[PDB]
Scaffold this motif. Structure first.
Motif, short mmCIF file in Angstrom:
data_model
loop_
_atom_site.label_atom_id
_atom_site.label_comp_id
_atom_site.label_asym_id
_atom_site.label_seq_id
_atom_site.Cartn_x
_atom_site.Cartn_y
_atom_site.Cartn_z
N UNK A 449 -3.25 1.15 8.17
CA UNK A 449 -4.02 0.86 6.97
C UNK A 449 -3.83 -0.58 6.51
N UNK A 450 -2.74 -1.23 6.91
CA UNK A 450 -2.49 -2.61 6.51
C UNK A 450 -3.03 -3.59 7.54
N UNK A 451 -2.91 -3.26 8.83
CA UNK A 451 -3.48 -4.13 9.86
C UNK A 451 -4.98 -4.29 9.68
N UNK A 452 -5.64 -3.27 9.11
CA UNK A 452 -7.08 -3.34 8.90
C UNK A 452 -7.43 -4.15 7.66
N UNK A 453 -6.60 -4.07 6.61
CA UNK A 453 -6.85 -4.90 5.43
C UNK A 453 -6.57 -6.36 5.73
N UNK A 454 -5.59 -6.65 6.60
CA UNK A 454 -5.40 -8.01 7.07
C UNK A 454 -6.67 -8.55 7.72
N UNK A 455 -7.43 -7.68 8.38
CA UNK A 455 -8.63 -8.12 9.10
C UNK A 455 -9.78 -8.39 8.14
#
Ligand code: QIH
Length: 895
Positions: A449-455
């Motif tokens: 869920x965080x790797x996607x918000x980084x994107x």
């Protein structure tokens, strides 16, 4: 080297902390910050040497201009056909005679076209044809610059003349600008070279976080320097939590209780989180707690000391091995057992409660994955499972997303809405103002869920600085978010607005995880390329140096600043010395001579002010309130201790400028020792923002955000407003409720009468709306003042966040007896109604500005309930008509 040791002690004098004490710290982050921040110093110095000598004068005397050249329509109408009368002064070196020259020009001429019209008028009868008005005019407009008469403020850049603040206020205050020709060589000859030198303190395997699949455990060994009362305290334990910006990523985990005599645990605490699932800003928050037994009453857990650690260090390394953490005294007010908002790091006073810890060692250095890996793990499992046409928004759904964007920092986003925001995160790039709310929807303990918000953040559209600041408060610890915010400030934040917002921006530095970060490098580079910003940058940092939680951070930042600020360091040392004398003098008047007659105190004051060391330190330095003001000789006969609570000093200096008679000939500043003036700085900041919001929308409600600067611990300066008097002084001259009105009639006879009532009505309306929203308290007859021209303004803002007397409405109604029923009163009401709704439109701005200061230690800004008062007075829980309805109620309550 010799020339480095003389600079080291001058930096130490300015900071108040010896530079050698920074060489003695072995923390590699401290020494790496000291070394790596110098790249910002060289970039700034290089910028000052690009177009030298001009670029160097631009640094010392930057243009003091508004954010936009555009004029509100009611301000342009104050001009004649769009033109401004301007008096230009020339000094003729024989006799230093002052020749005046009145010009009339378009408000949007750049300085060099105003210089042109000045020489065309200086030689207007000198028998010069068109072929001779180009030999003298074209050569001189490259050799001269314009200076404001009475202060060190220059017009060195091709801005529209009316965009300069000095000119903008002359247009709005109905005064006439007085400028002065200066030869470029005269100014340039006074700028030193500022040769910045690099100080002498310059010159195995790794595994990813995401492959270390294992739960997190932390060992709590023992605690030293734990001094408790063995006679009443029963047991002791260590309470612990894993936090991401004040939010817990898992359940807190205590140690076992042990006798307060043997504080040893030798225990591995295990946490409900997985090591790959640790966010980058993950923090360990712990504290030592006591337990006291009571019959019939429950046990009381009182925290004894607290401390916070970054799970990752400044090199992205997951921390391993043994470490000793020195803890901090408990803040008066902290009613929980952990302090997640407190700064991180070991207390520098190493003779304090010390807690020894240990982290696992996974056979090699462990580091947080770089964007490469994050992207691969983000694109993968983005659609591990996959009704894709239902996440498609409908008019009702899209609007809701916008309604969530209108919410203030203090709004609560329900769990229903957090899953809404997250599922439709691919649309949110279309409404970039949702980003603060979309970021709070992440479950930051989930690396997917965080790797996607980084994107989504990597290619997120920029947002306005007023909202980018929100992402810099302490509830957004992640460096990707804070890097986005800083990038938005670098692109869209003007210098004018930076200056106004600098207090909050320096305050938030203390929440940053590490010494080196994009915010501190942003602020430092702007402080080192704009000396007016650098001046207040210095004092917002120096004035906090006494707080031990930040004194190391701010001391290092001041060190790098003082090394690269140029010859200004000498001027700052003159200001530091002058202030220390005033601090040491008024501390005697508050300790020794505190209960003696003002006669006794003055004799002590005049005698101390007459010593040689004192007159040297307090004559011939720059005003900390405005370094464009030179403070020359101290005219001691006009200095006096005042009759206010903290016995503030009324100090009077001659203005040594040649044109002093055109701005002000004596400069008067109130030195006050005893009250937290940061609290007043924040109010005057808001009042100034409220004025600009009203002007840009057509409300000439003239406020008076007078100057105010905190220089230290409950010490600071206050600008004296000239030609003003309090209501006490007015009413005592002739009490009757018509004394105020009669006093203004005398001071404003003839045509000026209607102007004075209008000015008093518009300034009074501005201050009733402001003081109501902000909850200014203790509104007595000495806190409201009036100027001879009718301008009203308040002056004591030591109380805020938890007033229409009769003889005010008499002035508005022009003396009528039914003041509540006059037409002049109808205009007063509608001004207040319009003024209320204009501020309410910017509630997020004013709430953010308090929220960012909630942890700064201001006595009357201690909890969210204090800030919630503005959420009430602004009626953010109702509709506009229902909110304008609300304001109408207390307007009818106000007599
Ligand atoms: C209602 C909660 N909701 C509303 C929005 N929210 C929020 C959180 C933080 C900040 N900013 C902040 C907060 C700071 N301290 C504090 C943070 C949290 C609690 C308190 C703080 N106190 C002090 C004195 O220190 C008082 C108690 C310091 C600097 N900035 C702004 C908003 C959390 C969710």
């Amino acid at each position: 080297n010799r020339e480095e040791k003389i600079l080291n002690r001058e930096i130490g004098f300015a900071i108040g902390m010896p530079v050698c004490e920074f060489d003695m710290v072995k923390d590699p982050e401290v020494q790496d910050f000291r070394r790596n921040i110098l790249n910002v110093c060289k970039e700034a110095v290089d910028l000052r040497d690009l177009n030298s000598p001009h670029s160097r004068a631009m640094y010392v005397y930057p243009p003091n201009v508004e954010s936009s050249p555009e004029l509100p329509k009611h301000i342009y109408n104050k001009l004649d056909k769009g033109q401004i009368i301007v008096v230009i002064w020339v000094i003729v070196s024989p006799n230093n005679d002052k020749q005046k020259y009145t010009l009339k020009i378009n408000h949007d001429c750049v300085p060099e076209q105003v210089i042109a019209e000045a020489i065309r008028k200086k030689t207007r009868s000198m028998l010069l044809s068109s072929e001779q008005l180009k030999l003298c005019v074209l050569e001189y407009q490259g050799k001269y610059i314009l200076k404001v008469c009475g202060c060190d403020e220059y017009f060195l850049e091709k801005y529209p003349l009316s965009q300069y603040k000095y000119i903008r206020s002359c247009i709005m205050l109905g005064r006439m600008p007085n400028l002065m020709l200066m030869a470029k060589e005269s100014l340039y000859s006074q700028l030193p070279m500022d040769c910045f030198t690099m100080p002498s303190y310059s010159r195995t395997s790794t595994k990813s976080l995401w492959v270390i699949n294992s739960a997190l455990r932390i060992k709590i060994l023992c605690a030293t320097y734990v001094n408790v009362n063995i006679r009443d305290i029963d047991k002791i334990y260590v309470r612990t939590g894993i936090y991401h910006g004040g939010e817990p990523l898992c359940d807190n985990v205590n140690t076992q209780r042990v006798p307060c005599s043997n504080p040893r645990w030798n225990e591995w605490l295990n946490y409900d989180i997985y090591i790959p699932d640790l966010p980058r800003a993950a923090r360990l928050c712990l504290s030592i707690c006591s337990v006291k037994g009571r019959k019939g009453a429950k046990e009381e857990h009182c925290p004894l000391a607290w401390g916070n650690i970054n799970l990752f260090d400044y090199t992205d390394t997951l921390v391993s091995g043994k470490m000793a953490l020195n803890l901090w005294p408990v803040p008066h007010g902290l009613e929980d057992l952990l302090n997640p908002i407190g700064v991180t790091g070991s207390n520098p006073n190493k003779d304090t409660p010390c807690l020894e810890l240990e982290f696992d060692w996974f056979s090699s250095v462990v580091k947080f994955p770089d964007m490469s890996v994050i992207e691969e793990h983000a694109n993968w499992s983005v659609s591990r499972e996959a009704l894709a046409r239902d996440n498609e928004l409908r008019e009702n759904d899209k609007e809701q997303l916008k309604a969530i964007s209108t919410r203030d920092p203090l709004s609560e986003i329900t769990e229903q809405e957090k899953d809404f925001l997250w599922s439709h995160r691919h649309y949110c790039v279309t409404i970039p103002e949702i980003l603060p709310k979309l970021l709070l929807s992440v479950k930051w303990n989930s690396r997917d869920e965080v790797a996607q918000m980084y994107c989504l953040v990597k290619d997120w559209p920029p947002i306005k600085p007023e909202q980018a600041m929100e992402l810099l408060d302490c509830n957004y610890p992640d460096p990707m978010v804070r890097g986005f915010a800083v990038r938005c400030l670098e692109k869209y934040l003007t210098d004018d607005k930076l200056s106004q917002y600098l207090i909050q921006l320096v305050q938030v530095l203390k929440y940053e995880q590490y010494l080196d970060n994009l915010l501190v490098r942003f602020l430092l580079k702007k402080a080192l390329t704009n000396q007016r910003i650098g001046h207040f940058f210095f004092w917002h940092l120096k004035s906090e140096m006494h707080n031990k939680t930040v004194s190391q951070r701010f001391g290092l930042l001041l060190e790098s600043y003082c090394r690269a600020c140029g010859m200004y360091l000498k001027h700052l040392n003159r200001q530091v010395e002058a202030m220390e004398k005033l601090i040491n003098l008024t501390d005697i008047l508050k300790q020794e001579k505190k209960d003696e007659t003002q006669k006794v105190q003055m004799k002590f004051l005049v005698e101390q002010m007459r010593r040689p060391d004192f007159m040297d330190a307090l004559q011939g330095f720059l005003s900390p309130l405005n370094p464009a003001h030179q403070l020359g000789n101290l005219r001691l006969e006009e200095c006096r201790i005042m009759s206010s609570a903290k016995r503030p000093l009324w100090l009077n200096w001659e203005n040594p400028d040649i044109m002093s008679e055109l701005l002000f000939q004596n400069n008067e500043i109130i030195f006050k020792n005893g009250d937290d003036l940061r609290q007043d700085m924040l109010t005057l900041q808001i009042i100034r923002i409220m004025e600009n919001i009203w002007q840009n929308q057509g409300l000439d409600l003239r406020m008076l955000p007078y100057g105010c600067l905190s220089i230290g611990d409950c010490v600071g300066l206050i600008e004296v407003v000239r030609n003003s008097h309090t209501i006490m002084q007015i009413q005592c001259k002739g009490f009757n409720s018509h004394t105020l009105h009669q006093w203004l009639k005398d001071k404003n006879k003839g045509e000026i009468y209607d102007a004075a009532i209008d000015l008093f009505t518009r300034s009074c309306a501005g201050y009733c709306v402001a003081t109501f929203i902000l909850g200014i308290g203790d509104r007595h007859n000495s806190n409201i003042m009036v100027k001879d021209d009718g301008q009203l303004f308040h002056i004591d803002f030591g109380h805020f966040l938890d007033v229409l007397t009769q003889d005010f409405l008499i002035v508005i109604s022009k003396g009528a007896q039914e003041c509540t029923k006059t037409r002049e009163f109808e205009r007063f009401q509608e001004m207040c109604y319009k003024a209320y709704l204009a501020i309410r439109q910017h509630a997020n701005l004013f709430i953010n500005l308090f929220s960012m200061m909630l942890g700064s230690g201001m006595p009357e800004l201690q909890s969210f309930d204090d800030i919630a008062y503005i959420r009430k007075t602004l009626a953010l829980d109702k509709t506009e008509q229902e909110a304008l309805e609300y304001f109408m109620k207390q307007m009818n309550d106000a007599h």
